[PDB]
Structure 1
Amino acid sequence: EKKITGYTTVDISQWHRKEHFEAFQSVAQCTYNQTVQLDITAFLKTVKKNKHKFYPAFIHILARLMNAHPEFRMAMKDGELVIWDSVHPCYTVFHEQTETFSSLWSEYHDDFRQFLHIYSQDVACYGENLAYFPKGFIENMFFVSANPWVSFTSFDLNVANMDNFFAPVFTMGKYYTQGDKVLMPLAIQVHHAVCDGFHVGRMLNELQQYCDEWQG
């Protein structure tokens, strides 16, 4: 083994969002959640036409977006701002017997068949390990918390200590029938310093785009 990942030191002075970040780092600091009833009618039907189940598929669709726009791949290094070359999904796995949950991460690959292979190998392996973090944390990761129990009309996350916490969090809900369409609640949490409403806003339209494309 041996690694090293996407350092991309951004100098904040040549940045077109220099004071925006500056202000939301200090006095105006805040995170924010928005939630959408997401059309998944075509996604689900094409995910059921294949023998895969709706999770790694969706994980992948998000991971793709997170690995398109650098505004989601930002964190704090040695007192400096960086952009990871890649970000990997840290999803929740539930334990029926003990009623607890573990969060674990797979390695992201653009090719869906490659990624699902990594995912399946990881979940078929650690899916029954009771360690809170069975594979531990990793520098370059974003989060997806499954919430399959509830068809929520809002999921707000409310962090105590948000300092430099830029890594975005997705919470996803219990899908439901409504008209012809099958809708499914999805929520994001992002630190305002690294995401203007515009950024979050377009990614939720490309998420709507990619769910109507294919499995991955």
Structure 2
Amino acid sequence: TGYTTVDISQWHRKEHFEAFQSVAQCTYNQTVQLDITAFLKTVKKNKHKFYPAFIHILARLMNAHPEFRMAMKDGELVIWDSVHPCYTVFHEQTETFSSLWSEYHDDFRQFLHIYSQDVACYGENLAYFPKGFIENMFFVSANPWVSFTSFDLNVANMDNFFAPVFTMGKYYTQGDKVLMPLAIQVHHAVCDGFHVGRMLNELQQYCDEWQGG
């Protein structure tokens, strides 16, 4: 876990971070209906599992702009060199769930081998965290039941909670498209509308143009 440090005093967000860090503190959530038609044909074509393919493109995005990798570390604003995805896994028998993370790598195929290995070893372990947590994770939850038009998280304690949370809903047909509900909660000290915005646009674009692989 390497990191580097933000120089708040030279930062064009100095004022925003100080305000969202003490008085105007807030988190905010956004839901979008993603067009997954092309993503889903690629995944089907490649016989990829959907969930890891999708955790993957989300992870690449968190590993493409530093505003999604902040943390407070021993009192300084820091940026992890990487963040690793931490996604939920459902247990049918007990009707409960676990959160597992898998080491991130640009190459989807290399992350896919890590991912299916972790699920193979840990998918039946009923701890809330079969393999512990690490400091530098982002969260992905599947909510496959509901085609929500809104999903929003209200965390009792948001101090330094900078790790982005995504919630993917249940996709559905609309005319020619397959659409999928996607929400992303982020903390306002470390992310503006622009950032979540650029992210979401890059997501829609990557989803359309990734060719499996």
CA displacement, residues 34-88 of structure 1 (integer Å, 9 cap, x when unaligned): 0000000000011001111211000100000000000000001001110000000
Aligned pairs for 1:76-95 within 5 A: 76-95=72-91
TM-superposed CA distance for 1:111, in Å, is 0.6
> Following the alignment from structure 2 to structure 1, what is the Cα–Cα distance between the partners of residues 210 and 199?
17
Q: Which of 54, 59, 64 is the equivalent residue of 1:63?
A: 59
Q: Partners in 2 of 1:154 and 1:6 — Cα distance?
A: 35
- Pairwise CA distance, 1:6: 2.3
* Cα deviations by residue, 1:133-174 (Å, 9 ceiling, x for unpaired): 001110111000110110000001001000010000000000
CA distance in 1, matches of 2:16, 2:182: 27
Per the alignment, residue 24 of structure 2 pairs with: 28
Q: Secondary structure at the match of 1:119?
A: helix
- Within 1, Cα distance between the matches of 2:206 and 2:124? 31
SS at match of 2:86: strand
Deviation at 1:13, TM superposition (A): 0.3
Q: CA deviation at 1:11?
A: 1.5
Whole-Å Cα distance in 1 between the matches of residues 119 and 164 of structure 2?
Answer: 22
**Whole-angstrom CA distance in 1 between matches of 2:46 and 2:68:** 30
What secondary structure does 1:63 align onto? helix
Measure the CA separation in 2 of the matches of 1:157 and 1:131. 22
Q: Within 2, Cα distance between the matches of 1:7 and 1:126? A: 28
User: What's the CA shift for 1:214?
Assistant: 1.6
CA separation in 1, counterparts of 2:183 and 2:14? 27
Counterparts of 1:87 and 1:163, CA distance in 2: 19
Equivalence map 1:102-181=2 (5 Å): 102-181=98-177
Give the distance between the partners of 2:124 and 2:28, measured in 1 at CA. 33
Cα RMSD after superposing both structures: 0.7
Moved beyond 4 Å, runs of 4+: none
Structure 2 residue runs without a partner (length 5+): none
Give the Cα separation in 2 of the matches to 1:48 and 1:117: 18
Q: Deviations over 1:85-121 (max 9, x none)?
A: 0000000000000000000000001011100000000
Match among 42, 53, 56 for residue 49 of structure 2: 53
TM-score normalised to structure 2 length: 0.98
Q: 1:49 and 1:131 mapped to 2: Cα distance?
A: 34
**Partners of 1:107 and 1:7 in 2: CA distance:** 16
Query: Where in structure 1 are there 5+ consecutive unaligned residues?
Result: none
- Bigger proportion of residues as helix: 2
TM-score (norm 1): 0.97
Q: Tell me how far apart the structure 2 counterparts of residues 16 and 162 of structure 1 sit (CA, whole Å).
A: 23
Task: Say which SS state the counterpart of residue 86 (structure 1) adopts.
Answer: coil
Q: Give the drift of 1:16.
A: 1.0
Cα separation, 1, equivalents of 2:145 and 2:131: 25
Partner of 2:183: 187
